[PDB]
Amino acid sequence: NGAQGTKFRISLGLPVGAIMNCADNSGARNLYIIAVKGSGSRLNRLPAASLGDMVMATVKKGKPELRKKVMPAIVVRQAKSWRRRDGVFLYFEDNAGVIANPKGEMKGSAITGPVGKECADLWPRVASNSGVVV
Template sequence: MIQEQTKLNVVDNSGGKVVKCIKVLKGSKKKTAKIGDFIKVVVKNSIFNSKIKKGQILNAIIVRSKFPLKRTDGSYLSFNDNAVLLLNNQNQMIGTRIFGVIAKEIKTIYFKKLISLSSELV
């Protein structure tokens, strides 16, 4: 579960390295987020000479979480780190590549491009 003040890794080539969650979106009283949810983040660490700068506020979607996710078949899925993909204000991906694996639960109408760019689905 991701909540406010959680630090997360960035798994695309947008230029950010580490971000911090400042708000969980899609609900006024929602306190935690899981894989596939949207959050608002602030960039804490970025790559030199990138378009993403430290202190910038962006949207993000969670693609990996340490907290176990229960699937419909009864199995559980958890990862070794918490990771996000950075999005712009129109909820389009900033980066053009995705590093590492992502969960199949991300498949939605809006993110068909995300599935095609990922190297492996789990």
């Protein structure tokens, strides 16, 4: 749901049990991943997210309004070296993600820092609430 067009493989940097920062001005500062929506299935392999993938994630350090409810979270910053089709390999400074409804519509009004190129392409309304892309 929500994702626009096809989705191509980039490296997986954020498994289940990883704390990423929160980037929107909704109230949360960090986010704890519990499940990844639309992942593969091996024996003993943890569900691993990447940039621009909707995960189910809980707030750990933030406003009580945003807590009490496990909610969808789209990862906007990865910090693990993924590849672009334009030659370069790149990575960010920290892991960050933004909270949204199952439809892909944003709760926050602005996203701080850089938003990934792939994430902003796949999710339209993230690019609507984006200050910086790349």
